[PDB]
Amino acid sequence: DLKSLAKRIYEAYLKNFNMNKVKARVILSPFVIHDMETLCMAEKTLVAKLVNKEAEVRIFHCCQCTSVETVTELTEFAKAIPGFANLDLNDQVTLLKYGVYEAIFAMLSSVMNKDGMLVAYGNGFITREFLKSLRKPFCDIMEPKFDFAMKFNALELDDSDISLFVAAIICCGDRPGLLNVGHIEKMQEGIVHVLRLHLQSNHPDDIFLFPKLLQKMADLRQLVTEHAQLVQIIKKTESDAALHPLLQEIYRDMY
């Protein structure tokens, strides 16, 4: 009843996300981008988009491409959440608008380790060092995300846990401008119930796992606000680039 919903959500997650934590950890052992030199050759194989321009922009263009891919996937996933489809159109869109970036960063942790992160479906590996060497303000984009990932990854969740977490992020009753707050809260109530009990079953060796995750939720909301603004800065300060149209609509006057 509760069990089943966890199965249905986990399977939806498995069908709809190209990257998951089992597949990432397996990979994490091909091509390393660690300096401007190795970056260029990376751009002779991996990235088929910009295919000069300032290195900082090339990098984060490639990053926004993946954001958009994930927004697509999160939409597919959400449709498979029992009940989601039945929400008002405008609500489904508002939930995803305010939800996707929080969920993006949650799942990004899966491909990050203390050295760097998998990129482009796990065929690239850009070092944390390298990113930290990019000119301001670009060297300050990914650092807070690695910070979050190291704390998240310490909880040692698996995909079954993550799938329910991501569902709970999306189905959140307090996003600004919802119509049927009542119904979304009822949905949230159900999922969060399943999540807490699931964590207790799956990880009986950690009493406080569920509360730890609620704290991570708080962390991600702050992480997203900070990201929105640093994005805002870069839009004003740098025009050599341009933000993807779809991301422009998501970022718009939210936080």
27 binds ligand WUE (CB under 6 A): no
Minimum CB distance to ligand WUE, residue 60 (Å): 3
20 binds ligand WUE (CB under 6 A): no
Question: Nearest to ligand WUE by Cβ — which residue?
Answer: 241
- Segment near ligand WUE (CB under 6 A); pick from 13-21, 56-64, 156-164, 196-204: 56-64
128 binds ligand WUE (CB under 6 A): no
Q: Which is nearer to ligand WUE, 61 or 132 (CB)?
A: 61
Minimum CB distance to ligand WUE, residue 97 (Å): 14
77 binds ligand WUE (CB under 6 A): no
Site string for ligand WUE, 57-76 (x = CB under 6 A): x--xx-xx-xx---------
179: how many CB neighbours lie within 10 A of its CB? 13
Q: Is 201 known as a binding-site position? A: no
Q: How many residues bind ligand WUE (CB under 6 A)?
A: 17
Structure tokens at 25: 């950890």
Nearest to 99, CA basis, from 82, 115, 120, 75: 75
* DSSP state letters, 198-232: HHHHH-TT-TTHHHHHHHHHHHHHHHHHHHHHHHH
Rounded Cα distance, 28 and 209, in Å: 26
226 binds ligand WUE (CB under 6 A): no
235 binds ligand WUE (CB under 6 A): yes
Q: Is 101 known as a binding-site position? A: yes
Pairing relation of β-strands 124-127 and 31-33? parallel
Q: Which is nearer to ligand WUE, 197 or 228 (CB)?
A: 228
112 binds ligand WUE (CB under 6 A): no
Q: Is 163 known as a binding-site position? A: no
Rounded Cα distance, 201 and 164, in Å: 13
Backbone angle region of 213, left / alpha / beta, with phi > 0 → left and psi within -120 to 50 → alpha: alpha
* DSSP state letters, 111-171: GB-SSEEEETTTTEEEEHHHHHTSPTTGGGTSHHHHHHHHHHHHT---HHHHHHHHHHHHS
Which residues are annotated as part of the binding site for indeglitazar? 67, 101, 251
Q: Which residues bind ligand WUE (CB under 6 A)?
A: 57, 60-61, 63-64, 66-67, 104, 108, 141, 231, 234-235, 238, 241, 243, 247
